[PDB]
Amino acid sequence: DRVYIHPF
């Protein structure tokens, strides 16, 4: 799932 990660 690390195609679109927004940790913000």
Report the C-alpha gap between 8 and 2 in whole angstroms. 14
Long-range contacts of 1-8 (CB under 8 A, 24+ apart): none
Distance CA 7, CA 1 (A): 13
Ramachandran bin of 5, using left for φ above 0, alpha for ψ from -120 to 50, beta for the remaining angles: beta
Displacement of CA 5 from its chain's centroid (Å):
0
Length of the chain in terms of residues written: 8
The encoded tokens of residue 2 equal 């690390």
